[PDB]
């Protein structure tokens, strides 16, 4: 079929990698997974409601918060229905269904209610208070604008036509030798690993370091063939003592067969603990990489793989073990305790990650007992889903499919709003899966095909990894292709325009970067005008905001910015004529910063805002849109009406460390029309400042430069450029005299706003502390999947101190107030030093 072959070249263009390309494979796992996923894909496409899928209603089950309830008139919401040039406002009870909001339009004085200017529809049996746009409208005090129109054709989402246990011998590997085409002493270290657990360790004799070093040794391991668990790795490492190269091979394949034969595995080098050290993929660059030659006995061959009481002090020992943070290491005593009292540990879902890390995986009867333990899962299965507990079972410490599957089972019960909250980190969690085909990969795939919004983000999350990870590109490319073959031609067409546009805008960014002024300013418009001609589509969906349709460029407004990395400031017209405003879509296109790092941080800010929403706290964070498109390249959402803290100083001062305290509050009044607005801008400042002080403190990205703190003309403060301190790594946070001056404090003093501040801080900080485990795991996972070199295990443990684990609320309240005071003690010291360092040298 030729129309099927041309379609593969389109998929290959959308993916950014050729999924058929067999040059970098040593087995059919990727083919077996491409084939393996055909069923979940066909089962979700067939099960989905075409109408609900066509319109992707964005709904939450969460109770409407208090701060949103108080903003109500009196059990009444004002919805402004539009049409052509007619606009009739209707009073509607928060509990009112959008179907009845038509019955209160066709009887009060077939057709769908779409938001004005957005591809966002208010459909299905859900109270309007439960729509995410509605809740967004209440928060920002915006008006609920709806334009009545026709439901999209669900025929546009049309999808195109489609024994190991009996051999008691000790395991062995023959290390033939290693070869590097260019250029000491050298040894091969072979390890039998099961999720961070090293079952056995062998080494070769140190030979001289030459372009070809041979051994012909049979390395015998202490573990028997029968004791090998499904998920075990053979980790090959080259030392010279300094590690230089690594490669991994799964011992038991995707078919449950033990590994036999000859393998020439090309090796991954070491640059400069992370997820890339765990890859089953081989280095694609053959011409320059080091390879290892090995043999595994191709024998016959096919070897396939198939309560009482407790003393007070022991129970008190177990309880103190179970109620410990995810990062506290377990000692051999703790592990022996947990395992002996395993049936008692099962009644405590919180214990599962610690109980499963007590299992000796290099022992078959032990692993068999662990399966008996999982058949008595009841408590876990019954319990109210805990994400932080679920994620602990998806980390690098778990290599058993069955242990991992119980966490994926817990995720099935997540509503879409929640899937979107944890999507970026569930996608990064795929890097920890022993096999390409997993319960997690299938989960991600089902959810994306079931919802266009999860699907839009899945695509960019996966695309970003395929574009910049050689260790994971193959695995991700197989999940992307599986998604793209079940989303619809409408989605396929959407993704097409987006890729086409973003790929053009990346060329522009890099060409402009090369020339580094009057000369450059010209080239900008010169290049942008050629694109707007015909090749570039009329409009395109915004990758960080799928609800928006970005039309033609505002060439006039578009500019190259004054920075080391020369970024593009682009402006786009809203392609939707139903838009209640002529406000542009501002996007920054940048090369230099690692936007992967920003994304991970931005997503943690969203989770922190959600932890605050559950405890009636709105800390006014601005976690702006950010989509990494490739290596050190991607896009940033422009936050409107915003300046940097440094430029505000540069205004009433001028390119010096002479930092005036008066400056901020001045600019705030200068940019406020009424004093009612100024009071609210100060109210926003106090709230946003506490939020970034706490968040920044917890994440440990607190010591920042003024140039990386932004403020809106409406008082909202926000941090920018996270992939800069994390890109290349004192005060706990930025709480400068200009910030304290806005709060009504000069030197060591107190005011009604500074007391307001400290109370919000302590409330916010104690709210995050109730989610210790969750924040720890996320932080730990972000460091492993997204942070290069910033690992060690010690960088991870920073979060324990910040979250003040082990301490009580009163002691925690005390600890945060100290930090607030070290900010007052330092004043402008750190800022002036940052200016000295960054601006000068
Ligand atoms: C969210 C955001 N908004 C605005 N108005 N400007 C930004 C920005 N974000 C970044 C940024 C975020 N990560 N890296 C840069 C940025 O540099 N700027 C300017 C100073 C041009």
UniProtKB/Swiss-Prot annotation:
Q: Where is this region: G-loop?
A: 560-566
Q: Which domain of life is it from?
A: Eukaryota
Q: Where is this region: Catalytic loop?
A: 700-708
Tell me where in this chain the C2 PI3K-type domain is found: 167-297
Q: Which UniProt keywords apply?
A: Angiogenesis, ATP-binding, Cell membrane, Chemotaxis, Cytoplasm, Disease variant, Endocytosis, Immunity, Inflammatory response, Kinase, Lipid metabolism, Membrane, Nucleotide-binding, Phosphoprotein, Serine/threonine-protein kinase, Transferase
Activation loop: annotated span: 719-736
Cleaved signal peptide residues: none
Q: Does Protein biosynthesis show up as a keyword for this record?
A: no
The GO molecular function terms of this record are:
1-phosphatidylinositol-3-kinase activity; 1-phosphatidylinositol-4,5-bisphosphate 3-kinase activity; 1-phosphatidylinositol-4-phosphate 3-kinase activity; ATP binding; ephrin receptor binding; identical protein binding; protein kinase activity; protein serine kinase activity
Assembly: Heterodimer of a catalytic subunit PIK3CG and a PIK3R5 or PIK3R6 regulatory subunit. Interacts with GRK2 through the PIK helical domain. Interaction with GRK2 is required for targeting to agonist-occupied receptor. Interacts with PDE3B; regulates PDE3B activity and thereby cAMP levels in cells. Interacts with TPM2. Interacts with EPHA8; regulates integrin-mediated cell adhesion to substrate. Interacts with HRAS; the interaction is required for membrane recruitment and beta-gamma G protein dimer-dependent activation of the PI3K gamma complex PIK3CG:PIK3R6.
Describe the task this protein carries out.
Phosphoinositide-3-kinase (PI3K) that phosphorylates PtdIns(4,5)P2 (Phosphatidylinositol 4,5-bisphosphate) to generate phosphatidylinositol 3,4,5-trisphosphate (PIP3). PIP3 plays a key role by recruiting PH domain-containing proteins to the membrane, including AKT1 and PDPK1, activating signaling cascades involved in cell growth, survival, proliferation, motility and morphology. Links G-protein coupled receptor activation to PIP3 production. Involved in immune, inflammatory and allergic responses. Modulates leukocyte chemotaxis to inflammatory sites and in response to chemoattractant agents.
Name under which the protein is recorded: Phosphatidylinositol 4,5-bisphosphate 3-kinase catalytic subunit gamma isoform
Q: Which organism is it from?
A: Homo sapiens (Human)
